[PDB]
Amino acid sequence: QKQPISKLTRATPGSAGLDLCSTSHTVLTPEMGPQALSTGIYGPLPPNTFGLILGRSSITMKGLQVYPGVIDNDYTGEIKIMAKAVNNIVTVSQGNRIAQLILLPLIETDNKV
Amino acid sequence: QKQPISKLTRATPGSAGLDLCSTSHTVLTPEMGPQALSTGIYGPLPPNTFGLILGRSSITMKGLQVYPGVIDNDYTGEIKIMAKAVNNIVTVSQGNRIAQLILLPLIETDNKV
Amino acid sequence: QKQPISKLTRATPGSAGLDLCSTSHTVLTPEMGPQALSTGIYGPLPPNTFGLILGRSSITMKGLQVYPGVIDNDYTGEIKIMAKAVNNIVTVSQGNRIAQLILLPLIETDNKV
Ligand SMILES: O=c1ccn([C@H]2C[C@H](O)[C@@H](COP(=O)(O)NP(=O)(O)OP(=O)(O)O)O2)c(=O)[nH]1
Ligand SMILES: O=c1ccn([C@H]2C[C@H](O)[C@@H](COP(=O)(O)NP(=O)(O)OP(=O)(O)O)O2)c(=O)[nH]1
Ligand SMILES: O=c1ccn([C@H]2C[C@H](O)[C@@H](COP(=O)(O)NP(=O)(O)OP(=O)(O)O)O2)c(=O)[nH]1
Ligand SMILES: [Mg+2]
Ligand SMILES: [Mg+2]
Ligand SMILES: [Mg+2]
């Protein structure tokens, strides 16, 4: 079954991000370029917020780049992590925390849709 | 003529980002490194906000990395997209939506200027 | 001695970011992959805020990629800049402004810790 964002956990009370884990074992090589890693977690977001997926610094330092991703407030699909091995072969084990979801205020503007 | 940020459009009502298109046809190769793509859109931003330029996930997944860029509230120059082809040759057609502008609250602090 | 975030400066009144400088001379090559650059600046952040470390566009355009980093509200360690030379050899002189700290509201949620 789909899991909502309310199922995510914070590492600590003062952690800005909600941790995102891949649900698959994935191996990445630099030549593969960007890959979208499955999380089994689904939008949408709390009212008046949007999300940003960012890397965890310990993962970034281990050579896996998470490309910052914008999660729209009303996206109801699966939140995937866009990732690339920078220089070396990187192996993601199932359940490893690979990224984090940050929630931010969605500012209203009069821009046309 | 310069176009202001109010001319940008959202893909959907609940889209966090305002789409940014290049005004030129540009081809990018990995060896070129970061390139600043013209948009013909100009700051400044709404009061008490700043901007962040981020990639669109469909573009990121096609091998074009947009480096997150900070747009200062009172910048009045042209908003450019900083982009790099990750692994392969990437071709941007004129008018293609390459990035998105997210607006965020500008927090005041007492840090010196 | 440790320096707090209140010691950072803005380039201009309307600058979104607080500039971060490396305290060391560092040379980076693409094959080195991500490196954590010392700043001598320490958390924590103002109440109800978290931080984001982002690149300065002039530095990004010179071939040094700063990986976006999340600074937790209650982190009390040293803020380091995660950086990689994209394509060429990059040299950071001591005191050069390499990145910027953006402060953002920390939204409360009921996610478990
Ligand atoms: O660019 C950065 C990013 C993070 N940091 C520090 C501050 C942040 O609060 C701390 C933890 O960052 P992340 O949560 O992104 N890293 P990770 O998930 O790997 O560690 P933790 O589980 O402790 O949160 O690392 C930096 O100094 N520079
Ligand atoms: O890292 C990400 C980024 C986006 N997404 C999903 C959520 C987001 O709302 C949706 C659309 O993202 P973008 O707007 O960044 N992509 P794009 O502009 O390519 O598609 P769209 O036109 O639908 O907005 O893709 C992820 O799952 N992971
Ligand atoms: O992706 C971007 C990032 C920045 N910019 C413009 C807007 C921003 O206000 C201006 C300055 O950006 P940064 O502060 O990130 N660059 P830098 O520190 O190199 O210049 P400055 O000292 O003037 O702030 O560059 C873009 O057009 N696209
Ligand atoms: Mg963390
Ligand atoms: Mg979009
Ligand atoms: Mg600056």
Tab-separated table of C-alpha atoms in Angstrom, chain A residues 4-112:
chain	number	residue	atom	x	y	z
A	4	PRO	CA	1.702	9.106	3.270
A	5	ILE	CA	4.241	11.662	4.384
A	6	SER	CA	2.906	11.462	7.949
A	7	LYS	CA	4.662	8.064	8.205
A	8	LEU	CA	8.106	9.621	7.782
A	9	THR	CA	10.234	10.209	10.846
A	10	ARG	CA	12.677	12.926	11.997
A	11	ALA	CA	16.058	11.801	13.259
A	12	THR	CA	15.810	14.249	16.197
A	13	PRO	CA	13.299	16.844	17.422
A	14	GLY	CA	15.315	19.649	15.849
A	15	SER	CA	16.008	17.906	12.478
A	16	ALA	CA	14.769	20.075	9.586
A	17	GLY	CA	14.204	17.054	7.341
A	18	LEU	CA	12.033	13.969	7.287
A	19	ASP	CA	14.156	10.985	6.333
A	20	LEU	CA	13.464	9.192	2.998
A	21	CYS	CA	14.669	5.592	2.512
A	22	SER	CA	14.803	3.573	-0.768
A	23	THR	CA	12.642	0.581	-0.813
A	24	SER	CA	15.010	-1.190	-3.180
A	25	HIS	CA	18.570	-2.286	-3.212
A	26	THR	CA	20.134	-0.176	-5.921
A	27	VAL	CA	23.706	-0.009	-7.292
A	28	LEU	CA	24.654	3.225	-9.090
A	29	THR	CA	27.631	4.022	-11.289
A	30	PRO	CA	28.653	7.473	-12.602
A	31	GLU	CA	27.926	6.510	-16.222
A	32	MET	CA	24.339	5.683	-15.334
A	33	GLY	CA	23.507	9.328	-14.739
A	34	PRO	CA	20.391	10.391	-12.790
A	35	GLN	CA	18.253	7.611	-11.413
A	36	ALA	CA	14.881	7.923	-9.667
A	37	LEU	CA	14.876	5.846	-6.492
A	38	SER	CA	11.582	4.469	-5.183
A	39	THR	CA	10.487	5.316	-1.660
A	40	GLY	CA	6.932	3.977	-1.428
A	41	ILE	CA	5.934	7.372	0.132
A	42	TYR	CA	3.303	9.511	-1.581
A	43	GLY	CA	2.171	13.130	-1.607
A	44	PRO	CA	0.212	15.263	-0.994
A	45	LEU	CA	1.659	17.719	1.409
A	46	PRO	CA	0.112	19.670	4.275
A	47	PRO	CA	-1.938	22.682	3.170
A	48	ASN	CA	0.087	25.764	2.185
A	49	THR	CA	3.348	23.830	2.057
A	50	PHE	CA	5.533	22.378	-0.623
A	51	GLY	CA	8.481	20.029	-0.218
A	52	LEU	CA	12.109	19.920	-1.117
A	53	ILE	CA	14.041	16.664	-1.371
A	54	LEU	CA	17.690	17.184	-0.429
A	55	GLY	CA	20.629	14.904	0.274
A	56	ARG	CA	21.757	13.824	3.682
A	57	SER	CA	25.255	15.142	4.203
A	58	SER	CA	26.655	11.783	5.258
A	59	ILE	CA	25.359	10.284	1.983
A	60	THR	CA	26.577	13.179	-0.142
A	61	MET	CA	30.026	12.772	1.409
A	62	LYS	CA	29.949	9.076	0.480
A	63	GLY	CA	29.647	10.016	-3.210
A	64	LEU	CA	25.905	9.871	-3.814
A	65	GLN	CA	24.467	13.141	-5.066
A	66	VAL	CA	20.752	13.717	-4.534
A	67	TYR	CA	19.486	16.332	-6.967
A	68	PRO	CA	17.264	18.811	-5.126
A	69	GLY	CA	13.734	18.079	-6.054
A	70	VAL	CA	10.569	20.160	-5.668
A	71	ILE	CA	7.465	18.389	-4.395
A	72	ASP	CA	4.294	20.235	-5.355
A	73	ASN	CA	1.645	20.689	-2.728
A	74	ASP	CA	-0.950	18.652	-4.546
A	75	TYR	CA	1.260	15.941	-5.992
A	76	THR	CA	-0.314	12.603	-5.122
A	77	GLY	CA	2.235	10.333	-6.823
A	78	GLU	CA	5.208	8.575	-5.333
A	79	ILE	CA	8.005	10.723	-4.011
A	80	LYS	CA	11.150	9.540	-5.721
A	81	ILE	CA	14.691	10.484	-4.986
A	82	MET	CA	16.759	11.646	-7.949
A	83	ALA	CA	20.271	10.411	-7.353
A	84	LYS	CA	23.615	9.966	-9.130
A	85	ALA	CA	26.889	8.322	-8.184
A	86	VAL	CA	29.409	11.148	-8.443
A	87	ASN	CA	32.742	9.375	-8.946
A	88	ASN	CA	32.633	5.798	-7.792
A	89	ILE	CA	30.255	2.887	-7.615
A	90	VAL	CA	27.674	3.453	-4.866
A	91	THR	CA	25.472	0.743	-3.359
A	92	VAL	CA	22.122	1.618	-1.663
A	93	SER	CA	20.776	-1.064	0.598
A	94	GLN	CA	17.028	-1.396	1.040
A	95	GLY	CA	15.877	0.801	3.946
A	96	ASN	CA	19.030	2.983	4.070
A	97	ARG	CA	18.182	6.673	4.572
A	98	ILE	CA	19.227	8.290	1.307
A	99	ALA	CA	17.579	11.720	1.374
A	100	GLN	CA	15.381	14.044	3.385
A	101	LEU	CA	12.157	15.903	2.802
A	102	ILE	CA	12.063	19.539	3.910
A	103	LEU	CA	8.717	21.298	4.178
A	104	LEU	CA	8.459	24.932	3.207
A	105	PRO	CA	5.699	27.542	3.064
A	106	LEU	CA	4.017	27.859	-0.300
A	107	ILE	CA	3.786	31.542	-1.090
A	108	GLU	CA	0.764	32.664	-3.118
A	109	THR	CA	1.288	34.986	-6.058
A	110	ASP	CA	-0.918	36.231	-8.873
A	111	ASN	CA	1.131	34.475	-11.546
A	112	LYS	CA	-1.152	32.932	-14.152
